[PDB]
Paper text:
Here, we reveal a unique mechanism by which the Legionella effector PieF perturbs host mRNA decay by targeting the human CCR4–NOT deadenylase complex. High-resolution cryo-electron microscopy structures and biochemical analyses reveal that PieF binds with nanomolar affinity to the NOT7 and NOT8 catalytic subunits of CCR4–NOT, obstructing RNA access and displacing a catalytic Mg²⁺ ion from the active site. Additionally, PieF prevents NOT7/8 from associating with their partner deadenylases NOT6/6L, inhibiting the assembly of a functional deadenylase complex.
We determined the cryo-EM structure of the NOT1:NOT8:PieF ternary complex at 3.5 Å resolution to further elucidate paralog-specific differences in PieF-mediated deadenylase inhibition. The resulting model includes the same NOT1 and PieF residues as in the NOT7 complex, while NOT8 is nearly complete, missing only the first five and last 29 residues (V6–G263 out of 292). NOT8 associates with NOT1 in a manner nearly identical to NOT7 closely matching previously determined structures, suggesting that PieF does not prevent the incorporation of the inhibited deadenylase into the CCR4-NOT complex. The structures of the NOT7 and NOT8 are nearly identical, with a few notable differences. NOT8 residues do not contact S99PieF and G100PieF. At the same time, T98PieF interacts with the R173NOT8 (N173NOT7), which additionally interacts with the carbonyl group of K96PieF, a contact absent in the NOT7 structure. Although highly similar, NOT7 and NOT8 exhibit their main structural and sequence divergence beyond residue 265—a region likely flexible and unresolved in either cryo-EM structure.
Residue numbers in the entry:
A (entry chain C): 6 to 263
B (entry chain B): 1093 to 1317
C (entry chain A): 1 to 18, 26 to 125
Write the structure that this text describes.
């Protein structure tokens, strides 16, 4: 593994220094793999919630409006698949107090086992408002050439819609996907591409063995899982889809919500 | 040169009723090579001195449906704003002040009102305001009304509405400048007008201490002069 | 034994297992900001609010402490949900499950499946 020269940890100190190399890196290397670490699912919805898609959206909403992000990993790649000559993954670490926040002990415990520093997160952590302010005027979001990649990104794209708008998520999915299309137009979802494939099924680590991909970093983290997401997509598209991702069917959709 | 007059004629009698037909005439007349000339003509001679007729030109851009031309227009606007900003700030340049205000209005109309951002590599607003405060009193007259004009169109954007972190980031700095005792009544009333237009309360904002960080204000990027 | 919290808009109901659930006390948020207590189930008595302490925020906190058998100098995992509801971070009909000690329900399979993206 190698989490030093390929993965860069972004704290609250080196945020404007490492956001300067993102604006100059998104111009030529556009595809961004995405991962989000958050304290889990903690609140269940009630009511006349039929329409299992609608149920999934409300389960997303009830938890996103109350829980707070703890990590966000972005990996930069170009169309062919090359990486930007050195540091290609940024692991943004946010603020999270283990004593005065919302979390599920079955997620926090295994994240702590994986290696997240919950004493360091309390002191040196990125404020979400500041991160969003730097993100809007960066070209990473709201552009057109950027094509985001993600794996089962139900909560991944909701936590940052809340972060990027500083407001609660919309009540129905109609007003959620409309704003998601304005923020991130291309939402290539590896799991949706998976449920059209001959045999590929399971989770991220259970498909990284079928695709024969080596994980760089430490498991369950944000930066080291975005890299695996990117490599998985650039192998699936090359091998199964005959170097094409049809925009109409497989793009703009998520798993569960779509 | 004969074509040069035709473009002026087409832009002169523009109206909402004949917009499509005039667009067809322009597409027939002007070429692809001459498009930069039309972009410079519209952003230098028509938009920047005529603040009343701006929705017409935004609708012209929408009807034409040319992303390359839109990028050319935006780049020319940014270049003009930079040229005006990094100039000798004479105290009597009312024409230049109005020119900058109108161009900033145009920028906010064609970027923020279109649900697109103002890129940092092209123009930074918060740093511009902080540099204006640190440079003196003359540059504030150039910057604060310009930023107010740019932010005026944020209310028509479902992305850049007040609760947006970036818009609050700019508005809290403007609130600090409003609280400043050395700022003038003109600028203070302009900030209050912008707050009213965005339907915010100047008392309900969350000002910080950005003007008190001498270390941060020393190493600022220089978009002014 | 398990405990439940239901936030049906302006009503925060706390209930205990007995999976039938019996409510113990409900907080109602009035028009502007007023908070009202409606201890029920036993419908009064039993759990007694101590002398002096009168404010709704404090009565609800004390009742949650007595329900969860927690320490005095402790802000338990139900107290946090109560505070979030009062501050207005729970503006929708929602359901919160808890064990007896007050933390959210232990869901190992869901956590493992939601961190492995299964
Ligand atoms: Mg993850």
């Amino acid at each position: 593994v190698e989490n030093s020269q390929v993965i860069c940890e972004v704290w609250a100190s080196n945020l404007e220094e490492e956001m300067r190399k993102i604006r100059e890196i998104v111009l030529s290397y556009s595809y961004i793999a995405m991962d989000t670490e958050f304290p889990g699912v903690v609140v269940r919805p009630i009511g006349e919630f039929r329409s299992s898609i609608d149920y999934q959206y409300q389960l997303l909403r009830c938890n996103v409006d109350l829980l707070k992000i703890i990590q966000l990993g972005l990996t930069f790649t170009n169309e062919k698949g090359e990486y930007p000559s050195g540091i290609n993954t940024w692991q943004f670490n946010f603020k999270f107090n283990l004593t005065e926040d919302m979390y599920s002990q079955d997620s926090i415990d295994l994240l702590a086992n994986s290696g997240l520093q919950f004493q360091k997160h309390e002191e040196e952590g990125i404020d979400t408002l500041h991160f969003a302010e730097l993100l809007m005027t960066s070209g990473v979001v709201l552009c057109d050439n950027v094509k985001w990649l993600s794996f089962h990104s139900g909560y991944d794209f909701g936590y940052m819609v809340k972060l990027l708008t500083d407001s609660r998520l919309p009540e129905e999915e109609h007003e959620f996907f409309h704003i998601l299309n304005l923020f991130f137009p291309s939402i290539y979802d590896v799991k949706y591409l998976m449920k059209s494939c001959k045999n590929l099924k399971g989770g991220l680590q259970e498909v990284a063995d079928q695709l024969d991909l080596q994980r760089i970093g430490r498991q369950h983290q944000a930066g080291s899982d975005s890299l695996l997401t990117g490599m998985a997509f650039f192998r699936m598209k090359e091998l199964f889809f005959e170097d094409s991702i049809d925009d109409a069917k497989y793009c703009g959709r998520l798993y569960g919500l779509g | 040169e004969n074509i040069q007059e035709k473009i002026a004629f087409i832009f002169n009698n523009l109206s909402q009723s004949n917009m499509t037909q005039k667009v067809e005439e322009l597409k027939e007349t002007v070429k692809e090579e001459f498009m930069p000339w039309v972009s410079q003509y519209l952003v230098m001679k028509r938009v920047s001195i005529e603040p009343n007729f701006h929705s017409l030109y935004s609708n012209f851009l929408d009807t034409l449906k040319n992303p390359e031309f839109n990028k050319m227009v935006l780049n020319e606007t940014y270049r003009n704003i930079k040229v005006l900003l990094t100039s000798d700030k004479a105290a009597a340049n009312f024409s230049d002040r109005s020119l900058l205000k109108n161009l900033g209005h145009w920028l906010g109309m064609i970027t923020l009102a279109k649900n697109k951002p103002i890129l940092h590599t092209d123009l930074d607003v918060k740093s511009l305001l902080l540099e204006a405060y640190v440079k003196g009193q003359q540059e504030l007259l150039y910057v604060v009304p310009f930023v107010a004009k740019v932010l005026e169109s944020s209310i028509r954007s479902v992305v850049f509405r007040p609760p947006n972190p970036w818009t609050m980031a700019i508005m809290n700095v403007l609130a600090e400048l409003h609280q400043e005792h050395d700022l003038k009544l003109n600028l203070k009333f302009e900030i209050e007008v912008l707050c009213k237009n965005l339907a915010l309360d100047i008392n309900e904002l969350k000002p910080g201490n950005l003007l008190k960080d001498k270390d941060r204000l020393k190493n600022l990027d220089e978009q002014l002069s | 034994m398990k405990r439940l919290i239901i936030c049906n808009g302006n009503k925060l109901t706390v209930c205990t297992q007995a999976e039938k659930y019996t409510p113990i006390f409900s907080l109602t948020k009035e028009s502007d900001n007023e908070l009202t207590l409606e201890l029920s189930g036993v419908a009064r008595g039993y759990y007694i609010i101590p002398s002096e302490l009168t404010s709704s925020q404090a009565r609800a906190a004390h009742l949650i402490t007595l329900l969860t058998r927690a320490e005095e100098s402790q802000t338990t995992d139900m107290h946090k949900i109560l505070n979030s509801f009062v501050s207005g971070k729970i503006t929708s009909g929602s359901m919160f499950n808890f064990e007896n000690d007050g933390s959210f329900k232990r869901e190992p399979e869901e956590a493992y499946n939601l961190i492995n993206k299964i």
